[PDB]
Design an enzyme around this catalytic site. Structure first.
Site, PDB file in Angstrom:
ATOM      1  N   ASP A  57      46.288  40.106  37.255  1.00 21.32           N
ATOM      2  CA  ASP A  57      45.606  39.570  38.422  1.00 21.32           C
ATOM      3  C   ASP A  57      46.056  38.183  38.864  1.00 21.32           C
ATOM      4  OD1 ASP A  57      43.797  39.130  40.428  1.00 21.32           O
ATOM      5  OD2 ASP A  57      42.021  39.337  39.170  1.00 21.32           O
ATOM      6  N   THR A  58      46.914  38.136  39.879  1.00 23.97           N
ATOM      7  CA  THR A  58      47.401  36.865  40.396  1.00 23.97           C
ATOM      8  C   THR A  58      46.303  36.080  41.125  1.00 23.97           C
ATOM      9  OG1 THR A  58      48.189  37.860  42.452  1.00 23.97           O
ATOM     10  CG2 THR A  58      49.735  37.731  40.610  1.00 23.97           C
ATOM     11  N   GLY A  59      45.172  36.732  41.392  1.00 20.02           N
ATOM     12  CA  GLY A  59      44.062  36.072  42.058  1.00 20.02           C
ATOM     13  C   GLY A  59      43.022  35.558  41.077  1.00 20.02           C
TER      14      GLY A  59
HETATM   15  C1  LIG Z   1      35.864  28.815  31.895  1.00 18.64           C
HETATM   16  C2  LIG Z   1      36.423  29.060  33.271  1.00 18.64           C
HETATM   17  C3  LIG Z   1      36.269  27.828  34.142  1.00 18.64           C
HETATM   18  C4  LIG Z   1      36.909  28.039  35.504  1.00 18.64           C
HETATM   19  C5  LIG Z   1      36.162  29.006  36.424  1.00 18.64           C
HETATM   20  N1  LIG Z   1      37.102  29.633  37.345  1.00 18.64           N
HETATM   21  C6  LIG Z   1      36.716  30.514  38.262  1.00 18.64           C
HETATM   22  O1  LIG Z   1      35.543  30.877  38.402  1.00 18.64           O
HETATM   23  C7  LIG Z   1      37.819  31.066  39.153  1.00 18.64           C
HETATM   24  C8  LIG Z   1      37.761  30.411  40.520  1.00 18.64           C
HETATM   25  N2  LIG Z   1      37.672  32.506  39.280  1.00 18.64           N
HETATM   26  C9  LIG Z   1      38.664  33.304  39.664  1.00 18.64           C
HETATM   27  O2  LIG Z   1      39.784  32.892  39.976  1.00 18.64           O
HETATM   28  C10 LIG Z   1      38.314  34.793  39.736  1.00 18.64           C
HETATM   29  C11 LIG Z   1      38.559  35.509  38.398  1.00 18.64           C
HETATM   30  C12 LIG Z   1      37.772  34.980  37.202  1.00 18.64           C
HETATM   31  C13 LIG Z   1      38.399  33.743  36.578  1.00 18.64           C
HETATM   32  O3  LIG Z   1      39.616  33.529  36.754  1.00 18.64           O
HETATM   33  O4  LIG Z   1      37.665  32.974  35.919  1.00 18.64           O
HETATM   34  N3  LIG Z   1      39.073  35.452  40.787  1.00 18.64           N
HETATM   35  C14 LIG Z   1      38.538  36.436  41.496  1.00 18.64           C
HETATM   36  O5  LIG Z   1      37.390  36.850  41.309  1.00 18.64           O
HETATM   37  C15 LIG Z   1      39.419  37.057  42.579  1.00 18.64           C
HETATM   38  C16 LIG Z   1      39.022  36.498  43.948  1.00 18.64           C
HETATM   39  C17 LIG Z   1      38.729  35.017  43.935  1.00 18.64           C
HETATM   40  C18 LIG Z   1      39.735  34.094  43.665  1.00 18.64           C
HETATM   41  C19 LIG Z   1      39.460  32.728  43.616  1.00 18.64           C
HETATM   42  C20 LIG Z   1      38.167  32.277  43.842  1.00 18.64           C
HETATM   43  C21 LIG Z   1      37.155  33.189  44.117  1.00 18.64           C
HETATM   44  C22 LIG Z   1      37.440  34.550  44.163  1.00 18.64           C
HETATM   45  N4  LIG Z   1      39.140  38.480  42.499  1.00 18.64           N
HETATM   46  C23 LIG Z   1      39.501  39.189  41.434  1.00 18.64           C
HETATM   47  C24 LIG Z   1      39.083  40.649  41.429  1.00 18.64           C
HETATM   48  C25 LIG Z   1      39.706  41.397  40.255  1.00 18.64           C
HETATM   49  C26 LIG Z   1      38.863  42.613  39.868  1.00 18.64           C
HETATM   50  C27 LIG Z   1      39.700  43.608  39.118  1.00 18.64           C
HETATM   51  C28 LIG Z   1      37.651  42.179  39.055  1.00 18.64           C
HETATM   52  N5  LIG Z   1      39.246  41.416  42.654  1.00 18.64           N
HETATM   53  C29 LIG Z   1      38.233  41.585  43.496  1.00 18.64           C
HETATM   54  O6  LIG Z   1      37.125  41.077  43.320  1.00 18.64           O
HETATM   55  C30 LIG Z   1      38.512  42.443  44.724  1.00 18.64           C
HETATM   56  N6  LIG Z   1      37.829  43.725  44.575  1.00 18.64           N
HETATM   57  C31 LIG Z   1      38.491  44.871  44.450  1.00 18.64           C
HETATM   58  O7  LIG Z   1      39.720  44.946  44.452  1.00 18.64           O
HETATM   59  C32 LIG Z   1      37.633  46.120  44.302  1.00 18.64           C
HETATM   60  N7  LIG Z   1      38.114  47.226  45.182  1.00 18.64           N
HETATM   61  C33 LIG Z   1      37.629  46.565  42.836  1.00 18.64           C
HETATM   62  C34 LIG Z   1      36.697  47.726  42.537  1.00 18.64           C
HETATM   63  C35 LIG Z   1      35.293  47.483  43.096  1.00 18.64           C
HETATM   64  N8  LIG Z   1      34.279  48.225  42.355  1.00 18.64           N
HETATM   65  C36 LIG Z   1      33.549  47.710  41.370  1.00 18.64           C
HETATM   66  N9  LIG Z   1      33.707  46.441  41.010  1.00 18.64           N
HETATM   67  N10 LIG Z   1      32.691  48.475  40.717  1.00 18.64           N
HETATM   68  C37 LIG Z   1      38.036  41.708  45.995  1.00 18.64           C
HETATM   69  C38 LIG Z   1      38.807  40.417  46.176  1.00 18.64           C
HETATM   70  C39 LIG Z   1      38.215  42.606  47.211  1.00 18.64           C
HETATM   71  C40 LIG Z   1      35.095  28.249  37.215  1.00 18.64           C
HETATM   72  N11 LIG Z   1      33.903  28.347  36.851  1.00 18.64           N
HETATM   73  O8  LIG Z   1      35.461  27.583  38.208  1.00 18.64           O
END
Ligand SMILES: CCCC[C@H](NC(=O)[C@H](C)NC(=O)[C@H](CCC(=O)O)NC(=O)[C@H](Cc1ccccc1)NC[C@H](CC(C)C)NC(=O)[C@@H](NC(=O)[C@@H](N)CCCNC(N)=[NH2+])C(C)C)C(N)=O
Lengths: 99, 99
Positions: B25-27
């Site tokens: 997941d690049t996102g």
């Molecule tokens: C200890 C950690 C500290 C840092 C912590 N970081 C985060 O919270 C950061 C911003 N989060 C992220 O980067 C998270 C992943 C979790 C993570 O990395 O921690 N990324 C994400 O959630 C990114 C979108 C995003 C990016 C940046 C900001 C906000 C949102 N989406 C990732 C996600 C992957 C999926 C397989 C679960 N994809 C989706 O959510 C996409 N959805 C889909 O593709 C759906 N069709 C999947 C099936 C749906 N059905 C179901 N769920 N039953 C959507 C974008 C259309 C914080 N609190 O700030």
């Protein structure tokens, strides 16, 4: 081009006559763009991710240019925290993951 | 290898000695794995995504093999829809996006 992953893979996109910054997301099946007043028909949809689901409007046959690359497809519009380009459009611009 | 995006970029990973399927997941900034027993001490943390925020167990310096490639870093374990490998480990194995 090649985009490293040290930073979030953000690029400029053009949709509905507007330029925005969107995140190239390989983990997204669909493309979700921030709330926009796009003209034309749409249908209600629910998309999910990490913390749950969000209500979005599905617009079909939407023309988007991703980093200079034109593509046409389904775009979901709603209260997304960030503009996300999913696999549905990434495949169209010939994007791959390489290691 | 080179992974096209017509299908979800899923790979086999090995964590805690157990094989699992994860999505490149690049996102995702971080790597989040479904609830599991993992050798190591942890601290509570909260992450957000589409839909909202969830509570996870933060494990540091965890050895994990991703598609035959080794990485050692932070692994977040919690109620995620699917196992995801974020940019933190994707960079460790040298993954880049190309188009
Ligand atoms: C200890 C950690 C500290 C840092 C912590 N970081 C985060 O919270 C950061 C911003 N989060 C992220 O980067 C998270 C992943 C979790 C993570 O990395 O921690 N990324 C994400 O959630 C990114 C979108 C995003 C990016 C940046 C900001 C906000 C949102 N989406 C990732 C996600 C992957 C999926 C397989 C679960 N994809 C989706 O959510 C996409 N959805 C889909 O593709 C759906 N069709 C999947 C099936 C749906 N059905 C179901 N769920 N039953 C959507 C974008 C259309 C914080 N609190 O700030």
């Amino acid at each position: 081009p090649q985009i490293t992953l040290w930073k979030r893979p953000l690029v400029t996109i053009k949709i509905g006559g507007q330029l925005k910054e969107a995140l190239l997301d390989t983990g997204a099946d669909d493309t979700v763009i921030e709330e926009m007043s796009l003209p034309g028909r749409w249908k209600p949809k629910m998309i999910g991710g990490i913390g749950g689901f969000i209500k979005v409007r599905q617009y079909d046959q939407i023309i988007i240019e991703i980093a200079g690359h034109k593509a046409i497809g389904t775009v979901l519009v709603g209260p997304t925290p960030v503009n996300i380009i999913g696999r549905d459009l990434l495949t169209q611009i010939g994007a791959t993951l390489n290691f």
